[PDB]
Amino acid sequence: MQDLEGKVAFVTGGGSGVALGQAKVLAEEAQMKVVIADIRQDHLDEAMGYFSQKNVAVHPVRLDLTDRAAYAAAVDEAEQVFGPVDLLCNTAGVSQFGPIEKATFDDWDWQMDVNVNGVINGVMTVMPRMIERGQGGHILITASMSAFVALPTTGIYCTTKYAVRGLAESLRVEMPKYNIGVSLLCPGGEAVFAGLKRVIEHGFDPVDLGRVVLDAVRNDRFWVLPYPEFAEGQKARDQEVIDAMMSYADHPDYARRMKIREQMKRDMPG
Amino acid sequence: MQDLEGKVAFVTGGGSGVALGQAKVLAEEAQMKVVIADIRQDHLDEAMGYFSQKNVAVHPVRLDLTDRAAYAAAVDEAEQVFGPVDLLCNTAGVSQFGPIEKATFDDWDWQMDVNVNGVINGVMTVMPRMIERGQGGHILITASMSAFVALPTTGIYCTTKYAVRGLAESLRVEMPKYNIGVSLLCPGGEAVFAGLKRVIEHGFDPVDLGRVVLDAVRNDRFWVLPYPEFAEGQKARDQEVIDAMMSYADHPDYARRMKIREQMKRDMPG
């Protein structure tokens, strides 16, 4: 998405953390009109304490993103204050780690509601409006490296981030025909992976990561995983699945399916 | 998991489809004591019509797997009739396809509850009992090739199957220390992928797929994707992510993180 100046961004969890970093970069550098949605009023107040000292257009709204009615109202408010949402940043998220066998249903429901339903709610509230308007748009989903890597004690969290990864890849297929871009950001949160992530944690900066997002939005990039370190580790994870698939290359039914495909490339147009 | 004869299997959705195929193979070939759990009584009756003509130990229980209290009761019933669950097959699943922009919240909630919460409910009901018993066990999660491949109109379904894939990979990390095996089956449900899957659909048989599962359980295999055809397609999908990661190999912060790692392999033990 180009020409971001004056366009409207809606950032969940925007009162703190990664989301605040995104809000800062979009409002200051990109000069977008940014709505920051956060459940906590004090976090909103803090962010506005910062933005009140900058030449920006930022509007706070207190929102529990698990509340579908309130979400719709918050987006209505965004439209009245600034205008139709051009860029949706689904960046809000929670995490509570522990052994999976000790997890409660309340633990599951809480993280599922915020991390998955929160993203679903935003997408389903905003994306149909984008399509109706017919001026395109962009949808950012902030997942995690946990959408690729399961770890001890991150069972629930991992499940929620895989989920929104699937949603993101699904949007990626159906949104382009509406000129709506889709980006999937995986900041994070093999003991080798832990050691590599820890160094990333040490250098991590929300504003710097915000500029990575900005770059991805401008150039309409889907995969936003700015970590070359994880490459060899991911290749190994990928190869497990490939090897699993190829372990049945021997099995007769496969040769039978290949016999049919061979015959069907003959006979027919293309 | 070995020595399956006489051991107890709990199969959700066991009254029909893939799940019934699993139940048949476990009850007849493996000679397990199989509990089939299904929401529909008539499907239960049909399956029992079949099993009543075989020398098997099969017990039906009508269960809405989205009902946590009922699920616990169904597993209690399994313990009273046969004994503690040794093999849990989370195979129940629903699907309703359509353009994502037309999806309702009811569409989301329904498929999320059955496909994701249904699996969570089973795992959280049975797995702590397995651990408490201290005799190990095995957990099968039946996802889909949609846990790897997003497709037009499969947005909700894809999201739910990615989710349980994450849960499966999470279980894979934490369960081995309790001698509990984990298997992830992806039957299915690039226009090339569609064409390849259609030929698989044509040859698909629930009993044959049931024998694939049996083989995976016996040999404690996690990745159960018996389709070599999808290899080259998946490699291409994998390479997108690798290339995305490596696209920042140039960026200074990465070289900075590598400088730190280089120094830390020196200095310290290992």
Author numbering:
A (entry chain A), B (entry chain A): 1 to 189, 215 to 295
What does the paper say about this structure?
A cellular pathway has been characterized that performs β-aryl ether (β-ether)3 bond cleavage using three sequential Lig enzymes. The first step in the Lig pathway is a stereospecific oxidation of the benzylic alcohol in the GGE substrate to produce β-(2-methoxyphenoxy)-γ-hydroxypropiovanillone (MPHPV), which is catalyzed by nicotinamide adenine dinucleotide (NAD+)-dependent Cα-dehydrogenases LigD, LigL, LigN, and LigO. The final step consists of a GSH-dependent lyase, LigG, that catalyzes the elimination of the GSH thioether linkage in (βR)-GS-HPV to produce glutathione disulfide (GSSG) and γ-hydroxypropiovanillone (HPV). Our structural and biochemical studies of the enzymes in the bacterial β-aryl ether cleavage pathway reveal the features important for substrate and cofactor binding and catalysis by these Lig enzymes.
The LigD and LigO enzymes catalyze the oxidation of the (αR)-substrates (αR,βR)-GGE and (αR,βS)-GGE, whereas LigL and LigN are specific for the α(S)-configured substrates (αS,βR)-GGE and (αS,βS)-GGE. We have solved the crystal structures of LigD, LigO, and LigL, which by amino acid sequence alignment belong to the short chain dehydrogenase/reductase (SDR) superfamily of enzymes. The SDR family is characterized as a large group of NAD(P)H (2′-phosphorylated NADH)-dependent enzymes displaying an α/β folding pattern containing a Rossman fold; this overall organization is seen in the LigD, LigO, and LigL crystal structures. The superposition of the LigD, LigO, and LigL structures using Cα atoms shows a root mean square deviation for LigD-LigO of 0.88 Å, for LigD-LigL of 0.70 Å, and for LigO-LigL of 0.93 Å, indicating that the enzymes display similar overall structural features. A sequence alignment of LigD, LigO, and LigL shows an identity between LigD-LigO of 40%, LigD-LigL of 38%, and LigO-LigL of 37%. In these alignments, the most sequence-divergent region is in the predicted substrate binding loop. This proposed substrate binding region is disordered in all of the crystal structures solved in the apo-form (LigD, LigO, and LigL) and in the structures of the LigD·NADH and LigO·NADH complexes.
